[PDB]
Design a protein around this ligand. Structure first.
Ligand SMILES: [Mg+2]
Ligand SMILES: [Mg+2]
Ligand SMILES: [Mg+2]
Ligand SMILES: [Mg+2]
Ligand SMILES: [Mg+2]
Ligand SMILES: [Mg+2]
Ligand SMILES: [Mg+2]
Ligand SMILES: [Mg+2]
Ligand SMILES: [Mg+2]
Ligand SMILES: [Mg+2]
Ligand SMILES: [Mg+2]
Ligand SMILES: [Mg+2]
Ligand SMILES: [Mg+2]
Ligand SMILES: [Mg+2]
Ligand SMILES: [Mg+2]
Ligand SMILES: [Mg+2]
Ligand SMILES: [Mg+2]
Ligand SMILES: [Mg+2]
Ligand SMILES: [Mg+2]
Ligand SMILES: [Mg+2]
Ligand SMILES: [Mg+2]
Ligand SMILES: [Mg+2]
Ligand SMILES: [Mg+2]
Ligand SMILES: [Mg+2]
Ligand SMILES: [Mg+2]
Ligand SMILES: [Mg+2]
Ligand SMILES: [Mg+2]
Ligand SMILES: [Mg+2]
Ligand SMILES: [Mg+2]
Ligand SMILES: [Mg+2]
Ligand SMILES: [Mg+2]
Ligand SMILES: [Mg+2]
Ligand SMILES: [Mg+2]
Ligand SMILES: [Mg+2]
Ligand SMILES: [Mg+2]
Ligand SMILES: [Mg+2]
Ligand SMILES: [Mg+2]
Ligand SMILES: [Mg+2]
Ligand SMILES: [Mg+2]
Lengths: 68, 223, 102, 43, 98
RNA sequence: GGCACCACCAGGAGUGGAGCCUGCGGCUUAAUUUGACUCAACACGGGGAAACUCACCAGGUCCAGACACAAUAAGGAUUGACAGAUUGAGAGCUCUUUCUUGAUUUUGUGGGUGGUGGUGCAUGGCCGUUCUUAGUUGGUGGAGUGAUUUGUCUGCUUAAUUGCGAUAACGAACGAGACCUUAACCUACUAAAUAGUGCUGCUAGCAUUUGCUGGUAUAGUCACUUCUUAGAGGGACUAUCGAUUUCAAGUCGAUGGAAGUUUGAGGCAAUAACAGGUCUGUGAUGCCCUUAGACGUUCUGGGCCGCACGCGCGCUACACUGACGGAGCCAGCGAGUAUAAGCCUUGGCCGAGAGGUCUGGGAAAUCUUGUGAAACUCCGUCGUGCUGGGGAUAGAGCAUUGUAAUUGUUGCUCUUCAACGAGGAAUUCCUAGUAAGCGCAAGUCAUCAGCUUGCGUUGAUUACGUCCCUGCCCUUUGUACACACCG
């Protein structure tokens, strides 16, 4: 399965509460932004965080999300 | 003589492994931590880290002089080809080797285990260790043997970071009734690491909001 | 016995110090107008030893698989022999060993 | 340490052992004829 | 142990002047490469010296590490009938380095 | 309730039936050393033992019994010894024999020391197992006088206590996941005479059209990094679009992609525990036993292989989807020496073979080596026959290793050509470059691989589901158990 863990789920939604105006619906732009916003120890976790943030951004435009 | 590349790097490692155990047996009473072999042109620098650099360098440095001679005569080295330096460990509390040797010297003095065990739990943390766990196994007056763990603080267990931020030291303690086995696991704080990663892999540090400025409609500031 | 074609062979277990010495020599071979060839990445050799976990012979048959990677690099320089050897002492490193062959 | 005592007096006695050693150890750091000739002089 | 007096001598003027001796653990070795006598003689001769508190003995990886006590220098001072000038070589106060 | 090819469903290959290899029990023995007995003992102790290994058996030496004493002792305490006898022995082991050395040392006392001797049910460490299942814990708050409890859960979802969500809980930690190694991509960087290529010198063969195949090339003092190597990076995050869903976590389809099963595969791996296995790995160990006619150690020979039998891991096979005979001819993981005590060995020359000999290369991306491997493929012979399937058993002979091959180490040659004609009750492993074949290398190793650990060649059938069997986990429940049903 592809269930994301808590280390990626909670860290991504902190970004939305903190940098929503600068975020977007594009993964490639979001991936570069989070490399200057967060100190990520490994490249794989950086893409994972941005990939779930993009899903949340895509979901916020369709209505209110729980936790943000 | 002529030694292959594969067999030369292994020989250097085997030489290190055998040399390291030699210091553990000889300088056990001085809290031996580790040895660093710094090869250089025309010299073989060896740096030993111990809690007490007086027992090695005693009575006009007689022991260290008589100790480097034991290595020239066993590895067929030129008398000038090796140089040994004794260096004090900066943070004695963060070295599990020093902490395990210190615990053994107390247990062999008849001191109670609880008083001895908590003496390294607080000494390790006082030096700034992120976490520490001590396991002591063996027999004490009772015929049956037991093991007791004394944890404190935060400890990591699985994956690569244990190879980066944790050093370990096991020694056997010779008691009148048997052998006591002690394990001293010390996890150093990753923020103070100066060579490897400076944080845990899943530590995410989000920057702060730089926003909440006031925007004015549309001027131009010239220079 | 002046300007020659001189080989320096670099072997070590760890690549960070190997590339620092390699780059430092390349750096010193750049500001010094010395023509150079390298570094050449030789195929790394994985020395593997597979033992049994059990000191005794009881339990499930479980094995350790230890490894010892050896990385070897050779760099060719066109400089007099005095110049190349002093470059080695500038870029001397405990981990990497150096052999010089004409 | 199987009693409720001697572990009371193991921590407070144990911790004062370390507290005495961190300060002592942090003070220890802050203030930082031959023979072969006798075998050849037979001339 | 039955050592000839002369062979025992060479064992004693190696443990003085370079007051440390290293011997590999093989009893049948013809020559210990540093004391021209049997290797077994070196082990047993120095087992007596460490038996009488004149040398410390350390064993690691099938090797003997013999070091001469300060009390043992005095023993060779008299028994060897040597000049009273002491300090073999590892005691010559060459002084360490900082 | 839930999960799982160490469970099943659909299937594949089988094993169990035969011969043989090897391990275990048994029997035997002079000894056939020994540990382990469900999973988690039985190709396991890296245990493929001619000597050693070795612990067993039949015999023979040495102290390598330090040290304080006491005795003895220069008018010599003791050690070595030719020759003959003795002995398996050119062991002065011992016996006749007188020579030599000289306070090192001989006897008694204590004290040692050494033990593959005993105790793994006295221990450390290590390892296996519960279990790699998904479980574990505390702060504040709520409940309870308390031990405790909630948090840690009805439901959905996941490989997962992992997430959504419900919620007297809120917010967290270990474990999981992250992490590390490896395999798959980069005509985008960095270079490479120990990698490769195009051109170019020089050069060969075949048709002459200027073409097609080569050799040579460490001075052509060329050009390039795609193939090869490896360092710094980039690249996949379930991305976009359809369905279902509490419109949530997610799941299933497409498109793009090198990669969309955690991308494939592993390494590490929590809180406790077992009388699990090892004192036969340790100059790791407590205690017991032994310590000179040794249970130490060494030497010789035998044994660990011994054979009416039961059992387990395997290899050949029972044929034609095949055997031979020629021919075609493709990998990857790796290893390799010196005054040694002898490494990998091409190339040449002998030999039917096995093998021998002379040189050379390589301490290695250079040489062995493109390891020209085997299955495999083509063309033939064979023609359903215990046959040219199968190659036990045995006779005679030829080489290699080793001091030593007898109880054949192994290899080769001729001959002998056995059971076996697809295997009862039962039972194992497995879902994609996987299973199955098929070989090759590394470990043990002077010699011996039917064994393991890996690597690659050829390469599928059938699910992608369930709790029916079996095992484990959770919840509820009962308990006179808590040394916890071995109660
Ligand atoms: Mg973790
Ligand atoms: Mg993990
Ligand atoms: Mg089964
Ligand atoms: Mg079935
Ligand atoms: Mg078969
Ligand atoms: Mg024997
Ligand atoms: Mg034997
Ligand atoms: Mg024995
Ligand atoms: Mg145990
Ligand atoms: Mg509470
Ligand atoms: Mg409470
Ligand atoms: Mg609970
Ligand atoms: Mg959890
Ligand atoms: Mg964690
Ligand atoms: Mg060339
Ligand atoms: Mg569209
Ligand atoms: Mg994985
Ligand atoms: Mg038992
Ligand atoms: Mg046990
Ligand atoms: Mg014992
Ligand atoms: Mg024992
Ligand atoms: Mg032993
Ligand atoms: Mg054994
Ligand atoms: Mg005997
Ligand atoms: Mg036997
Ligand atoms: Mg056997
Ligand atoms: Mg036999
Ligand atoms: Mg098996
Ligand atoms: Mg088995
Ligand atoms: Mg054929
Ligand atoms: Mg090659
Ligand atoms: Mg026939
Ligand atoms: Mg046949
Ligand atoms: Mg036959
Ligand atoms: Mg079945
Ligand atoms: Mg054999
Ligand atoms: Mg082999
Ligand atoms: Mg085997
Ligand atoms: Mg109850």
């Amino acid at each position: 399965g592809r269930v994301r863990t808590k280390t990626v789920k909670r860290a991504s939604k902190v970004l939305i509460e903190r940098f929503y105006p600068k975020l977007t619906l594009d993964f490639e732009t979001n991936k570069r932004l989070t490399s200057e916003i967060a100190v990520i120890q490994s490249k794989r976790l950086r893409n994972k965080i941005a990939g779930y943030t993009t899903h949340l951004m895509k979901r916020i435009q369709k209505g209110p999300v729980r936790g943000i | 003589a002529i030694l292959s590349k594969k067999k030369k790097l292994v020989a250097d490692g085997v030489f290190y492994a055998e040399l390291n155990e030699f210091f553990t047996r000889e300088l056990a009473e001085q809290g031996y931590a580790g040895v660093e072999v710094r090869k250089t042109p025309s010299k073989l620098e060896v740096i030993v880290k111990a809690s007490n650099t007086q027992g090695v360098l005693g009575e006009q440095g007689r022991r260290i002089h008589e100790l480097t001679s034991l290595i020239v005569k066993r590895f067929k080295l030129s008398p000038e080809g090796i140089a040994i330096y004794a260096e004090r460990v900066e943070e004695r509390g963060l070295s599990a080797a020093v902490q395990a040797e210190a615990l053994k010297a107390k247990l062999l003095s008849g001191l109670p285990i609880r008083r001895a065990a908590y003496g390294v739990l607080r000494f390790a943390m006082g030096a700034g260790a992120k976490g520490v766990e001590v396991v002591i196994s063996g027999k004490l007056r009772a015929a049956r043997a037991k093991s007791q763990k004394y944890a404190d603080g935060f400890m990591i267990h699985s994956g690569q970071p244990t190879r980066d931020f944790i050093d370990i030291a096991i020694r056997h303690v010779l008691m009148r009734q048997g052998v006591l086995g002690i394990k001293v696991k010390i996890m150093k704080d990753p923020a103070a690491n100066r060579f490897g990663p400076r944080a845990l892999p899943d530590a995410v540090k989000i920057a702060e909001a730089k926003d909440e400025d006031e925007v004015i409609p549309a001027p131009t500031v010239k220079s | 016995q002046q300007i020659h074609k001189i080989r320096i062979t670099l072997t070590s277990t760890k690549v960070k110090q190997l590339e620092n010495v390699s780059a430092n020599i390349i750096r010193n071979a750049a500001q010094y107008n010395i023509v150079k060839k390298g570094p050449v990445r030789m195929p790394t050799k994985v020395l593997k030893i597979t033992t049994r976990k059990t000191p005794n012979g009881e339990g499930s048959k479980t094995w350790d698989a230890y490894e010892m990677r050896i990385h070897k690099r050779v760099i060719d320089l066109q400089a007099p022999a005095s110049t190349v050897k002093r470059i080695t002492q500038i870029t001397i490193e405990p981990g990497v060993d150096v052999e010089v062959t004409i | 340490g199987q009693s409720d005592k001697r572990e009371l007096e193991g921590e407070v006695e144990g911790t004062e052992d370390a507290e005495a050693e961190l300060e002592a150890e942090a003070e220890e750091n802050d203030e930082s004829y031959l023979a072969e000739l006798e075998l050849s002089k037979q001339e | 142990m039955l050592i000839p007096k002369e062979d025992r001598k060479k064992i004693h003027q190696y443990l003085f002047q370079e007051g440390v001796v290293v011997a590999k653990k093989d009893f049948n070795q013809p020559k210990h490469d540093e004391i021209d006598t049997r290797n077994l003689f070196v082990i047993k001769a120095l087992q007596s010296l460490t038996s009488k508190g004149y040398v410390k003995t350390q064993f690691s990886w099938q090797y003997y590490y013999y070091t001469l006590t300060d009390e043992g220098v005095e023993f060779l001072r008299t028994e060897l009938n040597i000049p009273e000038g002491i300090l073999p070589l590892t005691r010559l106060k060459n002084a360490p380095a900082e």
